[PDB]
Enzyme design. Sequence first.
Site, PDB file in Angstrom:
ATOM      1  N   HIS A  41       0.817  -1.208   0.000  1.00 16.97           N
ATOM      2  CA  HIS A  41       0.000   0.000   0.000  1.00 16.97           C
ATOM      3  C   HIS A  41       0.852   1.259   0.000  1.00 16.97           C
ATOM      4  CE1 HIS A  41       0.281  -0.459   4.544  1.00 16.97           C
ATOM      5  NE2 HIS A  41       0.464   0.846   4.443  1.00 16.97           N
ATOM      6  N   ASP A  85       0.141  -7.832   1.809  1.00 13.61           N
ATOM      7  CA  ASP A  85       0.579  -6.438   1.749  1.00 13.61           C
ATOM      8  C   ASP A  85       2.107  -6.376   1.691  1.00 13.61           C
ATOM      9  OD1 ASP A  85       0.561  -3.684   1.796  1.00 13.61           O
ATOM     10  OD2 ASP A  85      -0.253  -3.502   3.825  1.00 13.61           O
ATOM     11  N   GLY A 174       2.503   5.952   9.033  1.00 12.97           N
ATOM     12  CA  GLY A 174       3.848   6.345   8.653  1.00 12.97           C
ATOM     13  C   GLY A 174       4.895   5.268   8.894  1.00 12.97           C
ATOM     14  N   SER A 176       4.325   2.049   7.979  1.00 12.28           N
ATOM     15  CA  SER A 176       4.056   0.995   7.003  1.00 12.28           C
ATOM     16  C   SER A 176       5.326   0.438   6.365  1.00 12.28           C
ATOM     17  CB  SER A 176       3.141   1.532   5.900  1.00 12.28           C
ATOM     18  OG  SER A 176       1.984   2.131   6.446  1.00 12.28           O
ATOM     19  N   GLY A 177       5.381  -0.880   6.209  1.00 10.40           N
ATOM     20  CA  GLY A 177       6.492  -1.488   5.492  1.00 10.40           C
ATOM     21  C   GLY A 177       7.743  -1.638   6.339  1.00 10.40           C
TER      22      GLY A 177
HETATM   23  C1  LIG Z   1       3.801   9.396   6.504  1.00 14.50           C
HETATM   24  O1  LIG Z   1       2.942  10.516   6.733  1.00 14.50           O
HETATM   25  C2  LIG Z   1       1.608  10.271   6.849  1.00 14.50           C
HETATM   26  C3  LIG Z   1       0.753  11.346   7.072  1.00 14.50           C
HETATM   27  C4  LIG Z   1      -0.607  11.131   7.268  1.00 14.50           C
HETATM   28  C5  LIG Z   1      -1.136   9.840   7.238  1.00 14.50           C
HETATM   29  C6  LIG Z   1      -2.503   9.618   7.412  1.00 14.50           C
HETATM   30  C7  LIG Z   1      -3.037   8.333   7.355  1.00 14.50           C
HETATM   31  C8  LIG Z   1      -2.175   7.264   7.126  1.00 14.50           C
HETATM   32  S1  LIG Z   1      -2.761   5.625   6.997  1.00 14.50           S
HETATM   33  O2  LIG Z   1      -2.663   4.968   8.340  1.00 14.50           O
HETATM   34  O3  LIG Z   1      -4.173   5.610   6.494  1.00 14.50           O
HETATM   35  N1  LIG Z   1      -1.748   4.912   5.942  1.00 14.50           N
HETATM   36  C9  LIG Z   1      -2.069   5.166   4.532  1.00 14.50           C
HETATM   37  C10 LIG Z   1      -0.793   5.218   3.680  1.00 14.50           C
HETATM   38  C11 LIG Z   1       0.399   5.577   4.168  1.00 14.50           C
HETATM   39  C12 LIG Z   1       1.456   5.556   3.355  1.00 14.50           C
HETATM   40  S2  LIG Z   1       0.845   5.040   1.853  1.00 14.50           S
HETATM   41  C13 LIG Z   1      -0.766   4.884   2.389  1.00 14.50           C
HETATM   42  C14 LIG Z   1      -1.420   3.501   6.196  1.00 14.50           C
HETATM   43  C15 LIG Z   1      -2.587   2.595   6.581  1.00 14.50           C
HETATM   44  C16 LIG Z   1      -1.810   1.456   7.246  1.00 14.50           C
HETATM   45  N2  LIG Z   1      -0.749   2.154   7.985  1.00 14.50           N
HETATM   46  C17 LIG Z   1      -0.046   1.639   9.167  1.00 14.50           C
HETATM   47  C18 LIG Z   1      -0.855   1.616  10.466  1.00 14.50           C
HETATM   48  C19 LIG Z   1      -1.929   2.378  10.669  1.00 14.50           C
HETATM   49  S3  LIG Z   1      -2.498   2.042  12.239  1.00 14.50           S
HETATM   50  C20 LIG Z   1      -1.283   0.889  12.577  1.00 14.50           C
HETATM   51  C21 LIG Z   1      -1.214   0.194  13.782  1.00 14.50           C
HETATM   52  N3  LIG Z   1      -0.324  -0.777  13.961  1.00 14.50           N
HETATM   53  N4  LIG Z   1      -2.044   0.508  14.772  1.00 14.50           N
HETATM   54  C22 LIG Z   1      -0.516   0.828  11.489  1.00 14.50           C
HETATM   55  C23 LIG Z   1      -0.506   3.325   7.406  1.00 14.50           C
HETATM   56  O4  LIG Z   1       0.317   4.148   7.789  1.00 14.50           O
HETATM   57  C24 LIG Z   1      -0.814   7.478   6.959  1.00 14.50           C
HETATM   58  C25 LIG Z   1      -0.287   8.767   7.012  1.00 14.50           C
HETATM   59  C26 LIG Z   1       1.075   8.984   6.821  1.00 14.50           C
END
Ligand SMILES: COc1ccc2ccc(S(=O)(=O)N(Cc3ccsc3)[C@@H]3CCN(Cc4csc(C(=N)N)c4)C3=O)cc2c1
Length: 222
Positions: A41, A85, A174, A176-177
């Site tokens: 993603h 993912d 932020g 992710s990955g």
């Molecule tokens: C790096 O800067 C930003 C700034 C604003 C952001 C607002 C939302 C999200 S996100 O949560 O919806 N995000 C979408 C995304 C990020 C990079 S490419 C698409 C993904 C959705 C899954 N994820 C990790 C995560 C969310 S909650 C969680 C947990 N372990 N609780 C882990 C994320 O960061 C990511 C955002 C990342």
Amino acid sequence: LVHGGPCDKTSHPYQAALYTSGHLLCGGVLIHPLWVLTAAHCKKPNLQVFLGKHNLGQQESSQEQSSVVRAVIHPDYDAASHDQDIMLLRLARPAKLSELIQPLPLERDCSAQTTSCHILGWGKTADGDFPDTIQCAYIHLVSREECEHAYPGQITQNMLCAGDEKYGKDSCQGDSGGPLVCGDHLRGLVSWGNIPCGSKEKPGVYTNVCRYTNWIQKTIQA
Ligand SMILES: COc1ccc2ccc(S(=O)(=O)N(Cc3ccsc3)[C@@H]3CCN(Cc4csc(C(=N)N)c4)C3=O)cc2c1
């Protein structure tokens, strides 16, 4: 990630930072001089990978910047559920390895014993802000049955859960990955989890890297 603290400077040589448009997009993990693993993603045009970074505001003598010439998402990635993912990024120039830039070995054994892990990233912290300095936290793998109850019907064999009942240490937006490291091998990649972040009742969910050994080898080998 929430409730962690700044990593020891020498303890995260495999951590990658992914940027697009000059802003942090995701984390990632160096697994080969030519390849970074991250979440599917995370795919966007004009990706820049930074290796050897610790503080994102600094120009660090250890850092290397590279474009990507190939981004290979797993064919069966499901955006809705985050199933499968995982994405391989082919670096335009091979990582200049050093003390602060090293690949991390994959955990190829799905039945691996080690459940004590750590996660890392520049994602959102508990105060809601984004840190300059990379954060680390110890967490524990949660049993599949434990996690299925947490997200009934939504957890596949391609997912791993991990969390911390004491502080709720967890990855966040932020991150992710980024690597879930258990027994000093790559066990998972940050994929999704609870929002607001925190794992006291719902664990974070991670891409089950051991499942993708063959697909990774075939891709790097192509
Ligand atoms: C790096 O800067 C930003 C700034 C604003 C952001 C607002 C939302 C999200 S996100 O949560 O919806 N995000 C979408 C995304 C990020 C990079 S490419 C698409 C993904 C959705 C899954 N994820 C990790 C995560 C969310 S909650 C969680 C947990 N372990 N609780 C882990 C994320 O960061 C990511 C955002 C990342």
